[PDB]
Amino acid sequence: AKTELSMGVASEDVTTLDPHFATTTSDRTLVSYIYGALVRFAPGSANPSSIEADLAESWESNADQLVWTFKLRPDVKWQGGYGNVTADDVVFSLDKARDPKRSAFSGDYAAIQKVEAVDAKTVRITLTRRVPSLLALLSNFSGGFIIPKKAFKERGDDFKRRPVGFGPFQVESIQPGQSVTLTANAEYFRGKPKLSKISYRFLNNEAARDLAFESGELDVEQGNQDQRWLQRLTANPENVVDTIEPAELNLLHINITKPPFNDIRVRQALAHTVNAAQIAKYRGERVNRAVPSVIPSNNLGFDPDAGVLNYDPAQSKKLLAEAGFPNGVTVTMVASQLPGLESLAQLIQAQVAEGGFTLNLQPVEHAAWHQMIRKDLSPIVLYGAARFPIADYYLTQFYHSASEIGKPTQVVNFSHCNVADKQIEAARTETDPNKQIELWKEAQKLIVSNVCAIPLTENLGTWARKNKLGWGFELKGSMPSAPLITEQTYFKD
C-alpha cells in the first residue's frame, strides 16, 4: 500500500539527537530509528537475551573475558554520504560514550579500559574486569549507538539537531515544535526500508492527538496509562493497542538533604499517605502495577519484600505533629508537563493531602523539566524510567552517591541517597549469584527504609495503531518503551 507513516507523540519538540545525551522517550525513540550499534536487541524485544549482530558481524572474547574482538561488517554506509563505517568511528563513539564530559551515560562504561582499532574492520575492547552484561552496553540503547567521527567533529554543537547515523531512517528536516521528517536510508545495510518517509508529529495535547488519530491523520499515536483511553481505542475493530515492555517505574525521589525532608519522620509521613495500589487500580492493571521496591519488577535482583511503607494517613498526621508540623507541610515541586507524569503528579497531590501535605505543582515543559531537576531545583522529583534489567543499573544511576546531582559523575540520583553505596558496589562485582542477589536486595531495603524514594506504579508503554500497519515482528518490548520502526515496517492492502 502507501509508504508514508505518520505518528503522533507526547512531546513538544526535539531536544537532542546525539545518542550519548538523548534521555526523553521522544528523543530516545527518534535515536532508535536513526542509529545502530555493534550489536542490537532483536527488533520487538527489550530483553538482553535477544541481542544479535548489528554493525559487528561476529565477535569473540579471550578465555578470561577481559579482551573482546569485534569484526565489523565491511560496506555498512553512513547516511548522507559520510562513507563506510570504520573501526575508527567505533573507537571515537565508545570513547565519547564513556567520557563524563561528552556523554550522559559514562558511568555505565566505567569498566571499559580501552577501545582500539586493530584495522579498519576490527575493534578490540579491553575491560578492567569481567562485565557480564557487556553486550547490553554495546547495544542499540543509551551509550551503545555508533556515530561518525567526521560528522560529529565538524557539526559539534549542531550535531544534536543534524544527526547522522547508519540506521534505517535519516533526519531530512525538523519543523521546530511541529514535527521531524525522516526518510528511508536507501543504502541501509539490511535492505532499503519499505517505508519511504516517517512524519513524526509533536502532539503533546492528548485531545488533539486522539482527534488526529480518529480523523485518519495518524497511523500511530502514543496513548496514556488510563484504562478509559485503552477501552475507547480497543472498541474500534480497526485499531490495535500495543502495550510495550519494559514497564517504567515512577518514584518520588526526595532530596534527603533539604529541610523539612531531612527529618526521616517527614519522609515516612509522605510515604504513609501515598497509595500506589489505588493508582494502579484506577489507571488499570493491564498496563499499571504497584511495585514493592525502588527498582522495576523486571530486574535481576528485584526485592519483592523491600519493606515499602503502608498506606495510613492517620500515621502521616501523627508523624508530622511529632516532627513539628501540627498544621501539615507545604511543598512546591517542579513537575513535568508530559501528560502521563502531569496526571500522575495530580493523583499524588490529591492523595498526600489526606496525610497533611499540600503539594503545589509548578508545571514545566518535559525537556526543560529534565534540565531543571538535574540542577537540583526541585525538593522532590517524580521521575519514571526503566533501565537494563539487572539491578546494578537502576541502583547505581538513581541511588549510588557518585550519581548525586551536582557531581561531575551525576546521573539521576535526585534524592542524594548514599545509604546503599557499599552494597551496590559489592553486588556489582560479586561472582556468587545468590550473594549478588542478596546484596542487591539489601540495597533496596536500605533505600526503602531510609525513605530516599517512594515507589509508585510502573507502566508499560501504550501506543495505538491501525491494523493496516505491520511491524514485521511481534512488538513485545523496545528499550525506550516505544515502537521500533525498521526497514521491515510496512502497510497492508
Ligand X SMILES: O=C(O)CC[C@@H](NCC(=O)[C@H](O)[C@H](O)[C@@H](O)CO)C(=O)O
User: Which residues here bind ligand X, judged by CB under 6 A?
Assistant: 23-25, 225, 248, 250, 338, 340-341, 344, 384-385, 459
Q: What are the DSSP E strand ranges found in 327-479?
A: 329-336, 357-364, 380-385, 453-466, 469-470
- Residue 340 touches which of Mg ion, ligand X, none (Cβ within 5-8 Å per kind): ligand X
3-state secondary structure of 346: helix
Task: Please count the other Cβ atoms lying within 10 Å of the Cβ belonging to residue 148.
Answer: 25
Q: Which is nearer to ligand X, 396 or 459 (CB)?
A: 459
Helix, strand, coil proportions of the chain in percent (round to 5)? 30, 25, 45
Closer to ligand X by CB, 91 or 475: give it.
Answer: 475
According to CB under 5 A, which residues from 400 to 419 bind Mg ion?
A: 417, 419
Helices marked H in 47-119 — which ranges? 87-97
CB of 142 to ligand X, least distance (A): 8
**Binds 452: which of Mg ion, ligand X, none (CB < 5-8 Å by kind):** Mg ion
CA distance to 94, 134, 237, 300, per residue, from 137 (Å):
10, 5, 40, 16
Does 417 show up as a binding residue in the annotation?
yes
Give the separation between CA 256 and CA 454, rounded to whole angstroms: 12
CB 186 within 8 A of CB 194: no
For Mg ion, give the closer residue by CB, 170 or 450. 450
Per-residue string for binding with Mg ion, 10-29, x by CB under 5 A? -x------------x-x---
Residue span binding Mg ion (CB under 5 A) among the ranges 80-88, 211-219, 286-294, 447-455: 447-455
Least distance (Å) from ligand X to the CB of residue 461?
A: 7
248 binds, among ligand X, Mg ion, none (CB under 5 to 8 A by kind): ligand X
Rank residues 225 and 403 by Cβ distance to ligand X and give the closer one.
225
Is the bond leading into 176 cis (omega within 30 degrees of zero)? no
| Dihedral over alpha carbons 432, 437, 443, 445 (to 10 degrees) | -140
Of residues 199 and 222, the one with the C-beta less far from ligand X: 222
In terms of DSSP H, where are the helices of 235-294?
264-271, 276-283
Query: Considering only 261-269, 271-279, 291-299, 367-375, which stretch makes contact with Mg ion by CB under 5 A?
Result: 367-375
Using CB under 5 A as the criterion, which residues of the chain lie in contact with Mg ion when the complex forms? Answer: 11, 24, 26, 366-367, 417, 419, 447, 450, 452
- Binding-site residues from annotation for Mg(2+): 417, 452
- Binding-site residues from annotation: 417, 452
